[PDB]
Design a protein around this ligand. Structure first.
Ligand SMILES: Cc1cc2nc3c(=O)[nH]c(=O)nc-3n(C[C@H](O)[C@H](O)[C@H](O)COP(=O)(O)OP(=O)(O)OC[C@H]3O[C@@H](n4cnc5c(N)ncnc54)[C@H](O)[C@@H]3O)c2cc1C
Ligand SMILES: Cc1cc2nc3c(=O)[nH]c(=O)nc-3n(C[C@H](O)[C@H](O)[C@H](O)COP(=O)(O)OP(=O)(O)OC[C@H]3O[C@@H](n4cnc5c(N)ncnc54)[C@H](O)[C@@H]3O)c2cc1C
Ligand SMILES: Cc1cc2nc3c(=O)[nH]c(=O)nc-3n(C[C@H](O)[C@H](O)[C@H](O)COP(=O)(O)OP(=O)(O)OC[C@H]3O[C@@H](n4cnc5c(N)ncnc54)[C@H](O)[C@@H]3O)c2cc1C
Ligand SMILES: NC(=O)c1ccc[n+]([C@@H]2O[C@H](COP(=O)([O-])OP(=O)(O)OC[C@H]3O[C@@H](n4cnc5c(N)ncnc54)[C@H](OP(=O)(O)O)[C@@H]3O)[C@@H](O)[C@H]2O)c1
Ligand SMILES: NC(=O)c1ccc[n+]([C@@H]2O[C@H](COP(=O)([O-])OP(=O)(O)OC[C@H]3O[C@@H](n4cnc5c(N)ncnc54)[C@H](OP(=O)(O)O)[C@@H]3O)[C@@H](O)[C@H]2O)c1
Ligand SMILES: NC(=O)c1ccc[n+]([C@@H]2O[C@H](COP(=O)([O-])OP(=O)(O)OC[C@H]3O[C@@H](n4cnc5c(N)ncnc54)[C@H](OP(=O)(O)O)[C@@H]3O)[C@@H](O)[C@H]2O)c1
Ligand code: HEM
Ligand code: HEM
Ligand code: HEM
Ligand SMILES: CCCCCC(=O)OC[C@H](COP(=O)(O)O)OC(=O)CCCCC
Ligand SMILES: CCCCCC(=O)OC[C@H](COP(=O)(O)O)OC(=O)CCCCC
Ligand SMILES: CCCCCC(=O)OC[C@H](COP(=O)(O)O)OC(=O)CCCCC
Ligand SMILES: *[C@@H]1O[C@H](CO)[C@@H](O)[C@H](O)[C@H]1NC(C)=O
Ligand SMILES: *[C@@H]1O[C@H](CO)[C@@H](O)[C@H](O)[C@H]1NC(C)=O
Ligand SMILES: *[C@@H]1O[C@H](CO)[C@@H](O)[C@H](O)[C@H]1NC(C)=O
Lengths: 436, 436, 436
């Protein structure tokens, strides 16, 4: 039976130790005071730091970074041991080197393996290890690195190796972030959802309050969110394929592909996926508000008054078959536009994305990507034909609130149509392999 | 070219052997009778047990547990061999030790590796290995364990290592279960779906049969399932966050977190995920019945009679703008409540859950979890305002059938609101790190 | 610090080298001309082929297959080196042996490891490695194979080992295909979608143009796609479980299970999953056209004319409660039929499929699979009861266009009902273990 020593008897050291008592390991705690250790598991003795290190071959330091100073007092004991640095930091970039780098310079005669810093001690005690399933392992001594990965499987966890010790800077950044790449699409949507909210409140509850003075203020329950959400969903969709357009152009002015993109497009290259999933969220709301239109009391009432007026006044509707096209046109364009818009999202799962080579993935995300962007653009152009862009439409001096959202996608579709022309596209073909 | 011996020529031994003939291995079968072996692949000879063991270094025993007795007659031949125990059992807990433990005590001079017990022989023959893709490997001799994992990759499979031989008790439990954790939410929903079915049949087809005697019995096609399913979906949602409430309280009476939960809450801690996915199933039905309301003939007819009555009788509806709030209120609360209720389900995928650290996962599942539970509670409270809880509502002595489903969630929301108060929440903060 | 040599300085060699400069490796390029090398990273010298090979231990050949000829001129330099063949081919089956096999016969005194052939050089430069995340590694020398997998983790990638060098034929087929298994369901659906399109155009816009001459040509916007898509979705669903029926029968005529299926059923065994996901796509469209019926102008108008006619003519509808069953019957059958039809798709994810043993997977895909096929068949039979199959239905000599899609599923349901009978099913039980 193996023997595993743990320095520090605090929060993580109790929880990790009590897991290993249930997994068959001689757990030998080391604390500052072997006299008084109140909360401890049953079959695990507590010794001194110099005492407990002389018994195991695997030593886990469950202490913070600042209290590393006593380890230099015992570096002749730690010769050839396997030290498992598990520590984290309070915030990103607090120190110029990582802990495992800093731990290796404190004890040069021992092998350092970064591990366990992802999971939480409450997940070990409660056993509800759901997101804390993988354990990242990085280090330099490969033979000692395997012995750590023989422990982690016996804890019911999953070891994911991360290579050399140079990756330990990245791994400590991992459990401290809270949606780092989603910060740009959240702020970009929220500044566009608030602005479009106050834009449409002016058209739809203020203008009926100034002229033909009636309340009409229920519109911000469903109808104004049914106007904010799809234009948010359309603009963020057009913002996805816009760096693909710009960097295509920006390769032409340079005439090569070996120079660096100007670092503001480059973060906006990495946030392509982050935008498209946000655009999926708003389009899914625009679906659900639309399918629930015939339950709304304002829809039920207006269909009542329009019918009874046609009932008591003997005039009738002649069934204009032109309008029978259009009202069935954009809907059928919207469903085809939405189905692909789901199909891009199902591709975005990290398990579907790992089962598909990059040629098929380029076919889904780029060849079918514009095909979504067309059918979403045609869904609002055909709906725009019923409004026809008349001068009887703008209320004071400002339009019907969707044509502001049509500036961006029509810009992309025209310029992409330039880039498919053989006067340009054959130049694109040679420049993807090397050109002056 | 390597040589792989297989003891037993039955069901699995033919299928595993015929796979290895297509993968380039000298397959040497051993049976009881090398004379008569009718069904066998082409390039694989059949020898005796003592004969075939003297040729390979890797020996696979495709025999049941009870017919292990002849192996003691040849334990001097199996010195240093690699024995791959693949056997399963008829039911859980049939024997006090696992097979690989029991096999190691029969032959102490050989290394045991548990493998292959997950996949099926028909998946090997037909090549439609879809769910039988991973192969679990556990054992003690690490160098022999790698040589087994060099075979499994050559079969087009995926080796998942499981650590020491102590995990072999768990691995044989794996292919024998049939949704073990889903057993509690199935029974809890079914006893709540049947009870709520007979509860609403009494209100909706019995009471129109006693008083104002008319048929009205079509309601159990859609309308009664549109009443069973969301209250089932709401109660099972409130049952998710209820152990989080109770164990928060139960940490306060103890004043520490280092004592064990009382073993009936603990299984109901592990079945949190299992409930929430079932609540996603019923809420998704309550969506689809609701969106298809305007196609129902009973909905089309009642809208006809209400209009024609307003047509021939010249009275009209004055468009009560208070009702224009409420009917657009709970719908907009329901869509926001459903969108997050999907977003918890997309998080529950085992690939999305492995790409997210536990801080973000706690933010989705717990910070946004109650935010779903509020908006689902407000979706039925606002719908409850249209019924107003009047004495003209209960039929005999029993209410309008949703307020029975409001006992559980409002209980959770009040007590959780207690736990966010700083008179309690600051005590929660110190007790998550250690306290008397 | 390690030293990694790269033969060839072209497209991939620049991109792979510039990644390794950012990851800490002495990159030593070899080209034909060390004099003129214009585009190169900063800290990486360019030497001759014989010169650069004398410095590293790991040599990557970023050259095509045809320009392998100079390697025989320097095979005494490559003794014991680790050669990483990364090359691809222009099309499948261009040569009888793979590159790594062909490379090993050119240099017998070196170890060959196939790697890196999946990812693209633009993903390395741009850093948007999304689908090009995994790197497949296969080879024979296991100790040299690990040293390659120590490089790949330092590039931020994920090494997936593939076993011996015999798998290298398969790996080069991987990045060249473009949905290979989806080719059969695409063509089978498209030949069934076009045929059913021209079939229903004749019934629905031609017959109103011949008799009772009116336009009626808007029907091919939504209504004709609402007739093509579900019958496409139903037939492709019945085509899923049809090989399961036929091969069950075909085991009975043989009386064993150890003979090979006749190679046209066998490809149609592997394309089970490929069909069912396509049938999920068309059923999801038939959902979305159906839920958007009450927004169509043709639906709004016909409900207007039917009401006003019932308004001015004092006759009324007596609320036939038989029709109140049926219109609420097939809808409730369709929703139950669709919910399971989603639940089969959620199972089809490669991460959910790897978390479920084959007994539960057989219970979802086969026990609940027919339960979908029943409820989808009953969804159109009950809708067929409203049309009743009258002689007042067929227009010239041809029926109401869905009963053509009912030939296949009712065939499967009857013959499967034969196979559950104990006169047959007990014979099925013995024949799955061995029988004459
Ligand atoms: C719902 C949704 C989900 C999404 N999910 C994802 C996701 O998971 N991951 C993701 O990455 N994106 C995702 N996206 C974003 C979108 O799919 C990406 O833009 C897509 O990956 C590629 O689109 P593209 O037109 O930019 O093609 P790209 O190929 O990325 O861009 C074209 C340009 O890239 C350059 N380029 C491309 N290939 C080469 C080459 N071989 N050599 C030289 N230059 C080259 C050229 O400048 C070319 O003009 C998603 C979008 C949506 C709406
Ligand atoms: C659709 C859906 C999907 C779901 N999917 C999942 C899923 O995949 N996985 C899953 O696990 N659940 C899942 N759930 C359940 C739900 O998300 C869980 O309750 C969630 O994981 C945590 O919720 P909680 O309020 O119980 O938070 P918790 O943190 O689990 O519970 C709070 C209590 O836990 C204790 N506690 C928590 N952290 C600490 C700590 N650091 N120290 C000491 N005590 C602590 C305290 O007593 C605290 O009061 C799902 C639910 C739904 C509706
Ligand atoms: C939405 C959707 C998704 C799907 N996803 C998938 C998917 O991911 N993967 C997939 O494979 N299919 C998938 N399918 C197809 C369908 O689920 C398959 O048919 C299913 O895997 C098994 O169905 P089956 O009736 O053919 O059962 P099977 O068991 O495959 O077929 C029955 C016949 O197989 C033979 N057989 C089965 N077991 C044995 C045995 N032990 N010994 C001897 N003979 C045996 C017998 O001849 C038996 O009569 C999907 C279908 C749909 C509609
Ligand atoms: N959920 C978690 O809390 C969690 C999860 C994963 C990783 N970690 C990491 O575990 C490490 C330990 O943090 P923790 O949360 O578990 O708290 P902690 O262990 O209770 O506090 C740090 C420990 O350091 C010990 N120690 C020795 N000398 C000390 C000194 N001069 N001053 C203070 N402490 C001294 C203390 O125990 P003794 O005096 O008895 O030796 C003390 O218990 C951290 O680096 C953390 O990143 C924590
Ligand atoms: N789908 C599957 O069936 C499957 C899948 C995975 C694993 N397994 C496991 O494979 C093992 C073998 O089961 P199986 O399904 O493949 O059936 P089986 O091999 O046909 O029956 C067991 C084998 O034991 C051999 N044997 C030797 N002495 C025997 C004796 N006295 N009595 C009976 N049999 C004797 C028999 O072949 P010989 O007499 O010629 O030696 C017989 O073929 C089981 O443990 C099972 O858990 C089965
Ligand atoms: N996206 C990709 O392009 C990609 C991705 C992955 C893998 N690959 C693979 O990388 C390999 C190289 O293809 P590549 O795309 O990167 O193009 P490439 O390297 O630019 O062209 C092949 C290289 O071979 C070198 N070479 C030496 N003698 C040569 C000769 N007589 N004739 C022609 N070239 C000679 C050339 O550089 P020097 O003369 O200076 O030596 C030339 O750069 C291919 O096998 C490809 O499958 C390519
Ligand atoms: C489920 C399929 C869809 C249906 C049935 C649908 C239906 C509609 C309807 C009926 C309208 C007019 C709303 C009104 O009368 O005020 C509309 C507007 C709109 N839809 Fe869609 N839509 C769908 C999907 C999409 C998608 C995928 C997009 C693109 C993201 C989109 C973008 C828009 C936009 C921009 C508007 C204009 C908003 C406005 O002017 O108020 N829709 N949609
Ligand atoms: C798609 C979004 C949703 C819509 C449009 C919606 C709509 C409705 C409607 C119209 C009703 C009244 C049904 C009737 O008149 O008989 C209702 C009832 C109800 N909904 Fe929802 N709902 C949605 C989502 C949810 C969610 C997520 C929950 C919570 C799980 C929920 C729980 C309920 C409950 C409990 C009732 C009361 C059932 C009854 O009293 O008969 N709904 N919903
Ligand atoms: C969301 C649930 C579903 C609903 C509400 C639904 C509703 C309907 C409706 C109303 C019709 C008649 C359309 C018309 O009047 O022209 C119909 C037809 C049909 N549905 Fe569904 N359906 C659903 C799901 C399914 C599923 C899962 C299938 C099987 C793949 C299916 C197959 C069919 C077929 C074959 C027809 C006949 C097409 C025709 O004759 O024109 N449906 N469905
Ligand atoms: C408040 C919004 C939070 C959303 C969190 C989320 O779902 O994404 C978590 C992660 C994304 O994390 P990164 O890939 O690391 O950016 O999973 C996915 O890839 C999305 C797949 C989803 C495809 C349907
Ligand atoms: C009859 C109901 C059967 C449902 C089976 C199922 O889907 O769950 C299988 C598994 C659950 O298995 P366990 O995690 O082991 O409990 O996959 C998931 O995590 C659910 C992800 C799904 C998230 C959408
Ligand atoms: C034009 C249609 C293209 C569809 C591509 C696609 O989604 O499948 C890609 C892959 C399928 O690839 P193979 O399994 O290799 O056939 O992922 C899935 O398993 C489907 C899971 C999806 C379950 C919802
Ligand atoms: C219909 O609405 C108008 C205002 O739009 C109103 O004046 C009229 O009275 C209504 N007709 C009814 C309620 O019959
Ligand atoms: C209703 O439709 C018929 C034809 O189907 C038409 O002749 C009649 O005029 C319509 N009634 C109206 C518009 O009131
Ligand atoms: C409307 O319904 C009532 C019963 O609710 C019925 O008596 C009346 O005849 C109906 N009106 C019609 C059909 O015009």
């Amino acid at each position: 039976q193996e023997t595993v020593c743990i320095f520090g008897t605090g929060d993580f050291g109790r929880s990790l130790g009590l897991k290993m008592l249930q997994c068959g390991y001689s757990v030998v705690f080391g604390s500052r005071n072997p006299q008084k250790t109140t909360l401890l598991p049953s079959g695990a003795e507590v010794l001194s730091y110099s005492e407990a290190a002389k018994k195991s071959g695997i030593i886990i330091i469950a202490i913070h970074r600042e209290h590393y100073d006593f380890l230099t007092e015992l570096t002749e004991v730690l010769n050839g041991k396997i030290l498992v640095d598990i520590s984290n930091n309070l915030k990103i970039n607090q120190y110029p080197e990582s802990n495992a780098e800093y731990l290796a310079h404190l004890v040069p005669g021992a092998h350092v393996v970064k591990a366990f810093n992802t999971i939480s001690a409450w997940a070990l005690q409660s056993g509800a290890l759901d997101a804390s399933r993988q354990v990242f392992v990085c280090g330099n001594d490969s033979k000692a690195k395997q012995r750590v990965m023989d422990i982690v499987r016996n804890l019911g966890l999953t070891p994911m190796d991360q290579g050399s010790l140079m990756a330990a800077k990245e791994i400590e950044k991992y459990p401290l972030q809270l949606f780092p790449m989603w910060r740009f699409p959240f702020y970009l949507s929220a500044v566009l959802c608030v602005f479009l909210f106050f834009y449409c409140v002016i058209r739809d509850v203020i203008y009926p309050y100034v002229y033909e003075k009636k309340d009409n203020t229920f519109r911000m329950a469903i109808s104004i969110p049914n106007r904010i959400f799809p234009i948010t969903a359309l603009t963020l969709l057009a913002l996805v394929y816009l760096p693909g357009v710009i960097a295509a152009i920006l390769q032409l002015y340079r005439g090569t592909k070996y120079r660096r993109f100007p670092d503001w497009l480059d973060h906006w290259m990495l946030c392509r996926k982050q935008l498209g999933l946000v655009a999926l969220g708003f389009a899914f709301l625009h679906v659900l508000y639309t399918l629930v239109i015939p339950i709304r009391y304002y829809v039920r009432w207006r269909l009542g008054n329009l019918t009874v007026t046609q009932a008591i006044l003997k005039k009738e509707n002649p069934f204009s078959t032109s309008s029978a096209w259009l009202s069935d046109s954009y809907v059928a364009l919207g469903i085809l536009g939405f189905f692909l818009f789901v199909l891009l999202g199902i591709t975005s799962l990290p398990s579907v994305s790992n089962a598909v080579n990059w040629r098929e993935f380029r076919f889904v995300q780029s060849k079918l990507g514009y095909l979504t962007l067309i059918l979403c653009t045609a869904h609002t152009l055909v709906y725009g034909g019923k409004r026809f862009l008349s001068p009887s439409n703008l209320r004071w001096y400002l339009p019907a609130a969707y044509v502001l959202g049509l500036i961006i996608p029509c810009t992309v579709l025209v310029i992409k149509f330039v880039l498919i022309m053989p006067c340009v596209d054959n130049t694109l073909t040679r420049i993807r392999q090397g050109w002056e």
